[model samples]
Target: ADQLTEEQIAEFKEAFSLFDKDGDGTITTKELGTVMRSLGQNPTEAELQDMINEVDADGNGTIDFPEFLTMMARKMKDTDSEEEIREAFRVFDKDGNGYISAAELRHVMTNLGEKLTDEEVDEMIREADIDGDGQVNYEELVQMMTAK
Candidate 1:
């Protein structure tokens, strides 16, 4: 999960090569503002230095190909967790929309080899559904799933 995939590396290289062709194929503090803006968030110069320092393994204040790979690893780690969670959520939804009602919970479970009744289903909703709405939204489902 901390690792990057082939497609992920290809895309990373694609972005890097686009702007990286001129010089050493690495990002300097000068090009930092240019590329960093494209990465995410409106980063202040100090904020960007903090980001660079963490990933700047050789302490050269530049992100070379190898260093950029690590950056992509961190980035993809975040993306993988989010997409994986939502992917699980979609499986629970049958006729279920953005919200999962007691009806869908029961039906989804029944859709499995096992089955549960309204009492069981409602209890789950009571615990998982925020705002006491008797249905779970995406955030609620993520919280419930990730709950220890």
Candidate 2:
């Protein structure tokens, strides 16, 4: 199995912080709502509650760091391979543009049910932008997704 690099670890930590909106070391439906609103999608209270229920292991009405980490770790473990990360990025590069921009990433995330903030959107863009061209070409996407 591949190990995450220091930078990848940092990225994960940052993402965690963003999700934990209240700084209470946990994520609640409220926080998720904030993210959802930023993404221009307003999930109802029931919907948000259901989402929390799905991810919350303790039935505590909130998702703790451990729970969130478990989800992320599982996703990383499931999606990662020797080269699948690169391949996934290629898939994300829709429109045959050979590049993935912040707009494109935001659209994808929105489609995947993630409520993303503008900051989060921009962060992903900057993270994937390797050539300092304010965009992520196939090579840059491959490098980032495969780095860890």
Candidate 3:
């Protein structure tokens, strides 16, 4: 894992504490489920178990600061370049089906506090919908956004 700066370390510690509801210095799967729900993520029990299994490096069934930081660091690295693009795509993919259909794009643009014509939305979709599937998947959106 990459070394985190002192400030970054402090930030992670703060986040960990926030989720450590028991103040036990370790975040259990139960606490994690609460945090996820607070963040509007409705994860299944199996999903929560899988998450803890993935990050609980010591097999202790709990996440200490080090494990939490390691997990966060890896996530940060994975999303660093495409985070903004992913967020933009999410805004347009109202149904959250991992694809931005033409209708979804049109709906988002129409209600974005700026008037956009149907033709404009269609053009946007045409430019990014590379698979000819009438939808923009993550790969296509990333390519379109990153293209110069």
Highest lDDT model number: 3
Q: List the residue pairs that clash in candidate 1.
A: none
Residue pairs in clash, model 3:
none
TM-score of 2: 0.42
Tell me the tens digit of each residue's lDDT in model 2 across 36-81.
Answer: 6546875567877777788787888877766765665556543334
Could you tally the backbone clashes for each prediction? 0, 0, 0
Off by over 4 Å in 1: 1-80
Candidate with the larger TM-score of 1 and 2: 2
Top-down lDDT ranking = 3, 2, 1
Compared with the true structure, all predictions reach lDDT values of 0.66, 0.66, 0.69
Global fold similarity of model 3 (TM-score): 0.44
Q: What are the TM-scores, per candidate, against the unseen true structure?
A: 0.40, 0.42, 0.44
Considering every candidate listed, which one attains the maximal TM-score?
3
CA displacement after TM-score superposition, residue 58 of candidate 3 (Å): 1.7
lDDT of 3 by residue, 1-148 (tens): 1134567777777889888987899998888778775468666788888888897878787988878877655565323443444587676677999887767766766776767777876666666775677657765664444321
Taking every candidate in turn, the Cα RMSD to the unseen true structure, in Å, is: 10.8, 16.5, 15.1
